[PDB]
Amino acid sequence: TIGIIGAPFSKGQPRGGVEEGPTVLRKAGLLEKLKEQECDVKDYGDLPFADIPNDSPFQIVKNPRSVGKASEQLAGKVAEVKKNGRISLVLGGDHSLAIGSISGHARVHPDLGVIWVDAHTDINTPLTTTSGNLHGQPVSFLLKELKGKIPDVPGFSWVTPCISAKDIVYIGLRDVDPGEHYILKTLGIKYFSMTEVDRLGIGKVMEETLSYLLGRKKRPIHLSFDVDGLDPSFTPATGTPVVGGLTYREGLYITEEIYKTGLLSGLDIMEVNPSLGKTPEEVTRTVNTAVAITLACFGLAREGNHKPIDYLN
Amino acid sequence: TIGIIGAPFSKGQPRGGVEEGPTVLRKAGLLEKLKEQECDVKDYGDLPFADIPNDSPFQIVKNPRSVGKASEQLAGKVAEVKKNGRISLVLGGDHSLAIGSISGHARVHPDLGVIWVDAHTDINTPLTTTSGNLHGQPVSFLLKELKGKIPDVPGFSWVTPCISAKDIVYIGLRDVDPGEHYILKTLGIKYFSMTEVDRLGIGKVMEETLSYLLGRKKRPIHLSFDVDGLDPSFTPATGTPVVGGLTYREGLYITEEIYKTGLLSGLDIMEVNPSLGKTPEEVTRTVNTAVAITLACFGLAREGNHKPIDYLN
Amino acid sequence: TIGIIGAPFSKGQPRGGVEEGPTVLRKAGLLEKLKEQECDVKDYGDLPFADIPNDSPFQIVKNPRSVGKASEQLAGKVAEVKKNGRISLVLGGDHSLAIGSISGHARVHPDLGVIWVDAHTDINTPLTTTSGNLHGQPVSFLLKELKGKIPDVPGFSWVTPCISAKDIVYIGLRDVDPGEHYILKTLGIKYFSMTEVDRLGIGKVMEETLSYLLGRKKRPIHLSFDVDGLDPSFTPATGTPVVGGLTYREGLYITEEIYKTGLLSGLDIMEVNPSLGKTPEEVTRTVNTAVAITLACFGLAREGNHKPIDYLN
Ligand SMILES: N[C@@H](CCCC[B-](O)(O)O)C(=O)O
Ligand SMILES: N[C@@H](CCCC[B-](O)(O)O)C(=O)O
Ligand SMILES: N[C@@H](CCCC[B-](O)(O)O)C(=O)O
Ligand SMILES: [Mn+2]
Ligand SMILES: [Mn+2]
Ligand SMILES: [Mn+2]
Ligand SMILES: [Mn+2]
Ligand SMILES: [Mn+2]
Ligand SMILES: [Mn+2]
Ligand code: NA
Ligand code: NA
Ligand code: NA
Numbered sequence: 001t002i003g004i005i006g007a008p009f010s011k012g013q014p015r016g017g018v019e020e021g022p023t024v025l026r027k028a029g030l031l032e033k034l035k036e037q038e039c040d041v042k043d044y045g046d047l048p049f050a051d052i053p054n055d056s057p058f059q060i061v062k063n064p065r066s067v068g069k070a071s072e073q074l075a076g077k078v079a080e081v082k083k084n085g086r087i088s089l090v091l092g093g094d095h096s097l098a099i100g101s102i103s104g105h106a107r108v109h110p111d112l113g114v115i116w117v118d119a120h121t122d123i124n125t126p127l128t129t130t131s132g133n134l135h136g137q138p139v140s141f142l143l144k145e146l147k148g149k150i151p152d153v154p155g156f157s158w159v160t161p162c163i164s165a166k167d168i169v170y171i172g173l174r175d176v177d178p179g180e181h182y183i184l185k186t187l188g189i190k191y192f193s194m195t196e197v198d199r200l201g202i203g204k205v206m207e208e209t210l211s212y213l214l215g216r217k218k219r220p221i222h223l224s225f226d227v228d229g230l231d232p233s234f235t236p237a238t239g240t241p242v243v244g245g246l247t248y249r250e251g252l253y254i255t256e257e258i259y260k261t262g263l264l265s266g267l268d269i270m271e272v273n274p275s276l277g278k279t280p281e282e283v284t285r286t287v288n289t290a291v292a293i294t295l296a297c298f299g300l301a302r303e304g305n306h307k308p309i310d311y312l313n
Numbered sequence: 314t315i316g317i318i319g320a321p322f323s324k325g326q327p328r329g330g331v332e333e334g335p336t337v338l339r340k341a342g343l344l345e346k347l348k349e350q351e352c353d354v355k356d357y358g359d360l361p362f363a364d365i366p367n368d369s370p371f372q373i374v375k376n377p378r379s380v381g382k383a384s385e386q387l388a389g390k391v392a393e394v395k396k397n398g399r400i401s402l403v404l405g406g407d408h409s410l411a412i413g414s415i416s417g418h419a420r421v422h423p424d425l426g427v428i429w430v431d432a433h434t435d436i437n438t439p440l441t442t443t444s445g446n447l448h449g450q451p452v453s454f455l456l457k458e459l460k461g462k463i464p465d466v467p468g469f470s471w472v473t474p475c476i477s478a479k480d481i482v483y484i485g486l487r488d489v490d491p492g493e494h495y496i497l498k499t500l501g502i503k504y505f506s507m508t509e510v511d512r513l514g515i516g517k518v519m520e521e522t523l524s525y526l527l528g529r530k531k532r533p534i535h536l537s538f539d540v541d542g543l544d545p546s547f548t549p550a551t552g553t554p555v556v557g558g559l560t561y562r563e564g565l566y567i568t569e570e571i572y573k574t575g576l577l578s579g580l581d582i583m584e585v586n587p588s589l590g591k592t593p594e595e596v597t598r599t600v601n602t603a604v605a606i607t608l609a610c611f612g613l614a615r616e617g618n619h620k621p622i623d624y625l626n
Numbered sequence: 627t628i629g630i631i632g633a634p635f636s637k638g639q640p641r642g643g644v645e646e647g648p649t650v651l652r653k654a655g656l657l658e659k660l661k662e663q664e665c666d667v668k669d670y671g672d673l674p675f676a677d678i679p680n681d682s683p684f685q686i687v688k689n690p691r692s693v694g695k696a697s698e699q700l701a702g703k704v705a706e707v708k709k710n711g712r713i714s715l716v717l718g719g720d721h722s723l724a725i726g727s728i729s730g731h732a733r734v735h736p737d738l739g740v741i742w743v744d745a746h747t748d749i750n751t752p753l754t755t756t757s758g759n760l761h762g763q764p765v766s767f768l769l770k771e772l773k774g775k776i777p778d779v780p781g782f783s784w785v786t787p788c789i790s791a792k793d794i795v796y797i798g799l800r801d802v803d804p805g806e807h808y809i810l811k812t813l814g815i816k817y818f819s820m821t822e823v824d825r826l827g828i829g830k831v832m833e834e835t836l837s838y839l840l841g842r843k844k845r846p847i848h849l850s851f852d853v854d855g856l857d858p859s860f861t862p863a864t865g866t867p868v869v870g871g872l873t874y875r876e877g878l879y880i881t882e883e884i885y886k887t888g889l890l891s892g893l894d895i896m897e898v899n900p901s902l903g904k905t906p907e908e909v910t911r912t913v914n915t916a917v918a919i920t921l922a923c924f925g926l927a928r929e930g931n932h933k934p935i936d937y938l939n
Contacts, residue, residue, distance in 0.1 A: 197875075199828075312440075312492075
């Protein structure tokens with residue numbers, strides 16, 4: 001069963017237009033298409049994110065109270081969906097929302113493991129960031145090993161880090177800040193940058209990823225999918241594109257393999273910004289790619305699908 | 314030695330323009346280019362497909378008598394080419410013609426094995442099809458295991474199924490109807506959908522394909538190549554394109570490997586529809602890609618080719 | 627440490643515009659970007675290539691004296707840079723300059739091994755060439771095994787072949803003349819054509835390449851990188867593009883792996899011709915791709931880079 005949550009929120013980064021991700025994904029028939037695969041799909045609507053007009057930067061960190069609150073609300077809504085026995089599907093919205101999505105999920109399933117598909121590690125702290133954009137920091141707020149390195153940023157007093165360095169795998173990396181690379185190598189976080197993907201192939205990547213996270217014991221998976229993880233030729237309508245990304249095929253491979261574990265528990269589909277398509281067709285290409293990736297998470301398979309009936313009768 | 318047969322036929326599907334495939338492939342210098350690799354290339358011309366004006370649908374199956382007859386004629390012509398000791402090269406034309414091409418081939422070489430390169434399984438029956446388009450059904454007419462599930466469709470009383478479920482390998486699949494997936498899993502047909510290609514790489518795919526078909530004993534290969542098996546970025550001028558296809562490189566890899574078996578016996582180059590190019594360059598890109606794939610089947614190798622002489626003398 | 631040498635030279639082939647490669651690569655901030663990775667980057671300027679007005683063809687070989695001289699000068703400059711303890715970085719310019727670059731390098735490091743990344747083998751002799759273009763012949767001038775097959779071509783009396791057939795590996799091949807293929811198979815030269823890359827994946831390719839060249843003993847590597855080795859979709863602004871090339875990812879993989887050997891000693895970045903971009907964006911795409919490949923050679927890594935400091939302090 002699936003619980004859809006819309007998160008029309010942009011203040012984790014500078015470009016307007018990402019708050020429209022939930023609308024365009026919905027207008028592409030996401031809900032109807034999902035119903036062709038699972039009988040029980042519940043749309044919990046778009047979260048009403050109140051304007052927080054007074055929100056001056058904390059040091060260089062931008063819109064901290066807005067970002068913190070949006071994630072707090074989202075965590076509550078994800079925890080509710082999880083309690084209702086459903087897979088949470090978060091339509092973003094910028095990637096700072098993963099703070100809420102993962103935190104909420106972890107309230108119900110503290111043993112979850114995270115697969116983070118992104119060109120970026122999104123693990124800057126409030127102190128290592130040079131942009132101040134909170135969509136480049138969510139992982140730092142979630143990791144137990146970093147608690148004493150996160151300042152008390154207004155808006156985030158509610159956060160309790162819910163994952164260890166061992167509980168996350170990165171796939172797709174190709175634009176990692178030096179401080180983030182320091183944190184990555186210091187904490188021993190498991191990652192498959194595009195170098196690894198090139199070396200091993202996406203087949204070996206997914207085998208290793210899933211062995212790593214699930215080998216010891218079965219536990220819930222959280223897939224946090226930044227559409228910028230895919231090459232700009234597939235998902236151009238996004239805020240921080242980086243060339244040499246994952247292919248459309250590789251994207252579906254990742255999501256097909258995750259689906260087949262039967263352990264998908266939470267999903268974020270993040271950073272679709274239709275306002276940044278150069279043409280109407282760049283928008284449609286991005287949105288269609290996002291929809292495809294999503295459907296694969298809930299069982300659409302390139303080899304085909306059939307219902308348990310005799311089709312020759 | 315090579316025997317070229319043109320099959321300018323479209324009534325297996327709705328879009329006009331596929332009947333022009335043989336002309337554009339020929340105008341690209343297919344014949345001359347093939348002569349740079351084999352001395353003996355014989356053009357048996359384009360088959361004269363008579364209009365069959367009275368051809369109402371059989372249930373929802375469209376143009377059944379036209380399709381059946383075109384394939385009957387083609388089977389005769391392929392059998393003739395095979396008897397003349399030549400590799401048959403069928404220029405399509407829509408993929409329903411594979412009924413004729415494979416049937417004819419099998420009259421001379423009943424032990425043939427088929428490699429089917431396509432985004433689609435083309436294995437709907439007259440009873441499972443929802444489109445009624447016969448280019449989505451040819452494999453169902455050919456398979457022995459399905460004989461009792463094919464109704465007596467007008468135009469096809471001449472057909473005798475000539476292959477078993479073990480005698481075919483699919484490569485490229487990514488848009489398989491539920492009924493087709495049922496048939497695929499019921500009959501135990503060997504396939505490499507795009508998921509498999511992604512998992513294993515095209516190298517392992519071709520090793521497995523050829524081990525599967527040829528391991529027990531050497532026998533003739535029939536390659537039925539739907540240009541929609543390649544991604545629309547390579548072969549856009551085709552009727553049923555599906556994103557996330559095989560690459561140009563993968564296409565040449567498949568055909569290079571088949572060539573090197575020395576067992577290529579029949580070839581179909583199908584579903585080029587120049588009328589569907591958005592631009593002149595989409596047409597040329599499609600036609601050039603089709604020509605490349607074809608030349609690779611008869612020995613053009615990316616590492617290079619030389620004649621048995623001393624070039625430093 | 628790095629020594630940059632500009633080689634604004636085009637007479638190894640017919641198209642003007644390649645002499646501008648060094649300028650556009652420099653205007654893209656190549657030098658500044660390299661300084662973000664190594665403290666000591668020295669620009670030795672552009673070589674002043676004097677016009678040689680009287681330069682009639684030798685048989686069909688074009689501009690032989692111009693090409694020979696440009697390479698002689700370049701060899702001198704590379705040998706100087708090498709003596710100064712620096713990695714030579716040659717900005718081309720057409721690929722005939724590899725005669726000079728490799729020869730110069732070998733004067734200081736006779737044990738070097740060459741990795742040649744190209745759609746072409748560039749190993750025609752003055753006698754096997756059909757174009758007469760000297761950028762299709764440089765390897766033939768360098769190989770010891772061919773000495774008695776190279777005529778005394780005006781401009782090249784200074785050359786002494788400095789590498790054996792065992793000392794070179796080709797990656798990317800896909801348009802090899804028959805005579806070149808004869809030489810390739812006769813001399814037993816190690817190569818990974820696009821067929822091999824497709825078969826094995828770029829991961830296995832680089833493992834095999836580097837095992838082959840370095841397994842016995844560590845020695846200096848010379849990377850001669852023709853941008854036409856990458857697919858025209860990545861590096862369109864070049865004189866002899868060939869479809870089905872290496873990807874942008876594969877290009878960075880090759881160069882990342884070479885970097886990590888710590889044995890990179892000489893680098894050529896060749897055949898960027900901005901005059902051949904169909905649009906300003908084709909030029910920028912080509913130049914940016916060339917710059918990326920170069921930065922990867924000197925340590926820019928897709929997983930990230932950090933300096934030896936504590937970033938959480
Ligand atoms: N590391 C940069 C880029 C972050 C981009 C965030 B993302 O992955 O969600 O698009 C920053 O800290 O601003
Ligand atoms: N399965 C669909 C699509 C078939 C397309 C056929 B083909 O592979 O030859 O393009 C149908 O039965 O119509
Ligand atoms: N083999 C052809 C093409 C050579 C192209 C050279 B190159 O790799 O440097 O672009 C010739 O001899 O002219
Ligand atoms: Mn992100
Ligand atoms: Mn990102
Ligand atoms: Mn087909
Ligand atoms: Mn098809
Ligand atoms: Mn070259
Ligand atoms: Mn070349
Ligand atoms: Na992003
Ligand atoms: Na087709
Ligand atoms: Na070139």
